[PDB]
């Protein structure tokens, strides 16, 4: 009846590459790599820097980055679970869709 | 850093004057120093090593400086921070 539905310009492939070219640059450069040069940087230490950007001392961080890695770990394993078992996600895109 | 702003016929044209690096250099960090027993932590810097000494610098520019009291901060021991490097530390009160 005429209704054609066309295609995005970027694939999916394409979304993908961003986000892991984002996260990478994000992993290995802080801030830094939005505003110019990628600088590569330890991630513990741009973990202090960001401590110290929301007013924490870097030393919290130095002698208790075993337990933050374990929090971190344990939120992205809680956040896995509740996209797996919860539908309600992305229940804007689907209810755009 | 500022901006400029511009008339434009129905609309409005900014002239944003941002910093942008350049010629980046690549250099040894480290998390701690261990000089006195305890460790020492960058105040507004950090670590920087050319291969036989270390400094301190900002993080948006190489400024070396000498490892001081005035600089670096006292937390903790130095058996508790992972890659902690022994370096000596310079106390402006022992030469005064």
């Known amino acids: ?97 | 850093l500022m901006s400029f702003p511009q008339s434009a016929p129905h609309g409005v044209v900014f002239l944003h004057v941002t910093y942008v690096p350049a010629q980046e250099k690549n250099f040894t960090t480290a998390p701690a120093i261990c000089h006195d027993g305890k460790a020492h932590f960058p105040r507004e810097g950090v670590f920087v090593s050319n291969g036989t000494h270390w400094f301190v610098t900002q993080r948006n520019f190489y400024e070396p400086q000498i490892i001081t009291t005035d600089n670096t901060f006292v937390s903790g021991n130095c058996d508790v921070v992972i890659g902690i490097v022994n370096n000596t530390v310079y106390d402006p009160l022992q030469p005064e």
């Open chain 1, 1 to 97: 009846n005429g209704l054609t539905v066309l295609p995005p310009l970027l694939t999916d492939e394409m979304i993908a590459q961003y986000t892991s070219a984002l996260l990478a640059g994000t992993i290995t450069s802080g801030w830094t790599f939005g505003a110019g040069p990628a600088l590569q940087i330890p991630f513990p230490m741009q973990m202090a820097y960001r401590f110290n950007g929301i007013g924490v001392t870097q030393n919290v961080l130095y002698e208790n980055q075993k337990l933050i890695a374990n929090q971190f770990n344990s939120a992205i394993g809680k956040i896995q679970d509740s996209l797996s078992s919860t539908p309600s996600a992305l229940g804007k895109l689907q209810d755009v869709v």
